[PDB]
Amino acid sequence: KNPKSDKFKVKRFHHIEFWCGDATNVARRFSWGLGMRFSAKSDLSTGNMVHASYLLTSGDLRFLFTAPYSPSLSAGEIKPTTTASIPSFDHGSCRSFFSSHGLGVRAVAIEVEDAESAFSISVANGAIPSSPPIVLNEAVTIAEVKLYGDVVLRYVSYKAEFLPGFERVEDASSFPLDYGIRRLDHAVGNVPELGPALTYVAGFTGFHQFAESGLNSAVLASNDEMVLLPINEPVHGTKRKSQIQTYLEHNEGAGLQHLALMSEDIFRTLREMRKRSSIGGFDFMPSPPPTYYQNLKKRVGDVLSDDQIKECEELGILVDRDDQGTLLQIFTKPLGDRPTIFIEIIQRVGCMMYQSGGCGGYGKGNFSELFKSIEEYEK
Amino acid sequence: KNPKSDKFKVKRFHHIEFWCGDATNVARRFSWGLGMRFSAKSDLSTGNMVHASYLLTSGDLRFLFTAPYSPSLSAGEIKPTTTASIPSFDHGSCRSFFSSHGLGVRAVAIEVEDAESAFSISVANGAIPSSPPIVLNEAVTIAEVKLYGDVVLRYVSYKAEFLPGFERVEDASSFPLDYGIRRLDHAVGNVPELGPALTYVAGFTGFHQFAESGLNSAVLASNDEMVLLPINEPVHGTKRKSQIQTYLEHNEGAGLQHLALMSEDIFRTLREMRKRSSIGGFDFMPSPPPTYYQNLKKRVGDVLSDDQIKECEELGILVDRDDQGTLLQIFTKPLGDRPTIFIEIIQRVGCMMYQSGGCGGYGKGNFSELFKSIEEYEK
Numbered sequence: 026k027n028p029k030s031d032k033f034k035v036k037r038f039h040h041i042e043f044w045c046g047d048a049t050n051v052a053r054r055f056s057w058g059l060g061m062r063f064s065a066k067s068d069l070s071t072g073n074m075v076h077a078s079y080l081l082t083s084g085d086l087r088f089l090f091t092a093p094y095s096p097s098l099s100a101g102e103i104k105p106t107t108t109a110s111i112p113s114f115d116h117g118s119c120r121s122f123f124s125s126h127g128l129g130v131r132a133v134a135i136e137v138e139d140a141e142s143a144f145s146i147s148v149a150n151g152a153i154p155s156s157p158p159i160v161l162n163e164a165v166t167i168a169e170v171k172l173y174g175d176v177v178l179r180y181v182s183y184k185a186e187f188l189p190g191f192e193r194v195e196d197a198s199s200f201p202l203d204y205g206i207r208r209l210d211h212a213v214g215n216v217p218e219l220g221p222a223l224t225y226v227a228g229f230t231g232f233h234q235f236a237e238s239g240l241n242s243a244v245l246a247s248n249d250e251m252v253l254l255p256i257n258e259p260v261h262g263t264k265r266k267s268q269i270q271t272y273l274e275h276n277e278g279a280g281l282q283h284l285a286l287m288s289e290d291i292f293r294t295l296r297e298m299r300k301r302s303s304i305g306g307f308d309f310m311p312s313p314p315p316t317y318y319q320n321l322k323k324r325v326g327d328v329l330s331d332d333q334i335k336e337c338e339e340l341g342i343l344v345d346r347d348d349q350g351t352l353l354q355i356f357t358k359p360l361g362d363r364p365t366i367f368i369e370i371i372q373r374v375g376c377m378m379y380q381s382g383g384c385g386g387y388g389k390g391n392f393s394e395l396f397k398s399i400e401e402y403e404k
Numbered sequence: 405k406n407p408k409s410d411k412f413k414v415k416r417f418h419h420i421e422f423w424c425g426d427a428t429n430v431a432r433r434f435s436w437g438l439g440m441r442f443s444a445k446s447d448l449s450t451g452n453m454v455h456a457s458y459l460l461t462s463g464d465l466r467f468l469f470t471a472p473y474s475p476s477l478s479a480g481e482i483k484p485t486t487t488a489s490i491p492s493f494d495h496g497s498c499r500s501f502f503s504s505h506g507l508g509v510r511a512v513a514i515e516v517e518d519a520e521s522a523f524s525i526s527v528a529n530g531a532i533p534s535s536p537p538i539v540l541n542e543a544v545t546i547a548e549v550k551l552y553g554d555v556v557l558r559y560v561s562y563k564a565e566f567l568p569g570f571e572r573v574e575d576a577s578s579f580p581l582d583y584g585i586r587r588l589d590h591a592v593g594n595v596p597e598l599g600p601a602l603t604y605v606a607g608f609t610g611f612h613q614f615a616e617s618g619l620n621s622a623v624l625a626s627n628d629e630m631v632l633l634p635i636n637e638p639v640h641g642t643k644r645k646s647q648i649q650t651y652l653e654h655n656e657g658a659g660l661q662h663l664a665l666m667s668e669d670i671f672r673t674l675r676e677m678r679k680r681s682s683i684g685g686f687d688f689m690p691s692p693p694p695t696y697y698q699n700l701k702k703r704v705g706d707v708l709s710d711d712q713i714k715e716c717e718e719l720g721i722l723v724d725r726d727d728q729g730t731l732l733q734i735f736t737k738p739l740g741d742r743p744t745i746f747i748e749i750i751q752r753v754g755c756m757m758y759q760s761g762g763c764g765g766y767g768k769g770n771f772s773e774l775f776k777s778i779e780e781y782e783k
């Protein structure tokens with residue numbers, strides 16, 4: 026059941042912003058590892074004396090990488106005269122975030138009909154304000170409220186290309202990489218206590234809840250279920266230590282756990298990413314045993330052929346199934362030094378009407394299926 | 405004239421250590437951009453709860469990338485019980501360095517006969533101590549003194565594979581990249597005042613001085629002139645603003661300006677690096693006008709053929725000449741967000757006896773030749 030209770034009009038995920046120590050090196054690594062194109066910049070070469078921000082795109086997916094310059098370059102500025110293109114940016118906040126958490130997501134940005142309205146309604150309904158609405162060049166409005174930990178939910182609305190003050194990058198420096206990633210499917214937070222986190226976020230958004238090893242989790246969703254925000258809490262005392270708890274320890278508390286990126290062809294995406302794992306790209310979790318793929322015939326043999334299943338086996342892809350649809354997924358190793366944030370690659374099969382959001386679930390059935398396949402492979 | 409006045413026995417450059425916010429992403433970017441192999445690690449997976457350190461190698465060149473973990477992971481440790489593999493590391497120093505300077509070189513490390521002796525003699529002769537000698541697993545001794553700004557000169561000596569506590573990286577995660585880079589030729593500092601900097605460093609090392617647009621510079625060299633440490637100061641009031649002064653402003657003071665990496669085949673190195681510039685690697689300075697390469701015939705037509713000169717032209721390579729030998733060189737754009745540190749690729753022709761250090765100079769003749777070629781190309 027979907028009560029469609031959004032307190033303001035939400036459209037889609039807009040962008041994800043990483044706060045970095047050096048935006049250049051993270052953005053170049055991610056571009057190569059994920060097959061994302063450099064598409065916009067705001068830095069010294071565009072007159073920004075405050076922060077360096079670089080935008081990567083793949084389809085509708087937008088990854089922004091931002092780092093602070095020396096405060097000395099902008100010491101004469103005040104907020105009315107700022108050269109920052111993202112007015113919510115603050116040197117001290119950014120340095121403290123990265124010191125505390127390491128490389129990670131600062132902002133989960135969603136496009137809304139009216140960012141000022143979304144902000145006011147959010148705070149009237151319990152949201153902790155982070156940055157008030159600011160209109161950029163009379164064209165785009167941006168506002169921020171706290172989501173969890175030091176992560177903000179950023180509202181963006183357009184009257185009528187990324188943000189004012191960003192320049193399109195020169196074609197020569199913009200190599201058209203593309204491994205098939207097309208949009209952000211969901212963005213997942215880890216928190217110490219799920220209940221209060223859910224109550225807080227669902228409280229100010231009106232997002233509704235969507236449809237024994239490590240965690241409890243729930244998913245908040247917008248009206249059409251295209252903005253999907255799962256949240257995890259640890260389960261303590263378990264045989265193996267909870268990966269949610271490890272996250273909280275190494276991250277210094279709550280924050281974004283993983284970004285799930287939808288591919289239009291997960292087999293091409295994983296072939297291309299795995300070719301680059303050892304030459305600057307991303308590594309993937311250790312593959313499941315062959316028993317997992319043997320057992321896929323009984324589970325999804327009506328959705329995937331033998332060839333398509335064998336192709337899952339060579340690439341380490343996981344498969345889970347809903348009552349609505351089927352999900353192919355795989356997880357990277359952590360994106361940076363700490364065992365904190367990672368990426369999921371996903372493709373969904375079914376739920377055609379366009380495809381409805383969350384088709385096939387989030388792979389929670391793969392916890393049981395993995396452990397069983399582990400012991401079954403012990404044989 | 406070479407008075408051979410080293411106050412202790414110096415062998416060769418050993419490694420360069422970058423202090424990072426996220427060592428993983430910088431190391432992966434550099435590995436791909438420069439064709440360096442992942443060869444050792446010290447991080448959580450090796451029991452280091454303090455810092456993440458990753459070592460890249462190409463020939464004898466060793467680049468180390470280090471970033472701090474949360475201090476909470478090691479809060480119970482004291483120096484006698486540390487899990488850090490580099491005992492001079494300090495969370496606060498590293499965070500303050502990166503906050504102040506951004507991504508850059510913390511340590512210029514040279515191998516010496518006896519790091520304890522080198523340290524004591526250095527400080528007895530004016531060196532400002534940074535980290536006292538520490539013996540690692542009764543096998544390697546490390547000590548540090550201040551060089552300039554927040555850069556240290558690190559002494560390493562071996563009784564008899566990088567450092568104790570570092571593990572060799574798994575072959576699968578160790579792709580054998582190689583674009584021809586073979587060793588560190590020289591490491592260059594920018595300072596506000598050259599005289600005091602030279603007096604200080606030559607004072608404690610016994611290094612001797614080796615053989616109108618922007619700077620004054622001089623080069624300190626070890627006995628056999630294989631450890632080469634140029635230092636630049638700005639020249640103010642010039643028509644174009646000094647790039648040394650821009651460095652000091654954006655770096656928050658003195659620091660390492662560039663690393664010159666010798667290639668065994670500069671044409672292969674530059675072909676391979678330029679193929680990767682727009683897909684995660686490094687960008688190069690804008691190429692000289694065709695007049696520069698037209699004028700190369702008269703200057704080096706006895707060293708390079710027409711084909712070898714035309715090959716310089718397509719790759720943007722610069723050529724300068726000594727009375728001893730000839731130098732091919734090219735400069736990258738800055739390695740990170742700030743217009744501070746960059747890399748030079750070099751290959752030297754001549755001075756055979758082995759090749760003697762500094763053969764061909766450092767390209768200072770290319771300041772005049774570039775400006776002339778600029779106006780000549782205006783035509």
Ligand SMILES: Cc1ccccc1-n1c(=O)c2c(C)c(C(=O)C3=C(O)CCCC3=O)ccc2n(C)c1=O
Nearest residue numbers: 213239242255268283310356369387388389391392
């Ligand atoms: C537990 C674990 C340890 C070491 C590496 C990997 C894992 N690991 C996962 O992290 C994992 C995740 C993260 C999801 C997942 O995407 C997801 C949930 O965890 C909760 C609902 C929302 C959501 O999107 C699904 C299955 C997973 N499975 C099966 C798994 O094994």
Ligand SMILES: Cc1ccccc1-n1c(=O)c2c(C)c(C(=O)C3=C(O)CCCC3=O)ccc2n(C)c1=O
Nearest residue numbers: 592618621634647662689735748766767768770771
């Ligand atoms: C001035 C400038 C502005 C924008 C980009 C590039 C440049 N630029 C250089 O940075 C440059 C350098 C850095 C060297 C060089 O390697 C060097 C010295 O500068 C002093 C002696 C020790 C040493 O190693 C030589 C020639 C150079 N030339 C010719 C040049 O044009």
Ligand SMILES: [Co+2]
Nearest residue numbers: 213285369387
């Ligand atoms: Co997921």
Ligand SMILES: [Co+2]
Nearest residue numbers: 592664748766
């Ligand atoms: Co040089």
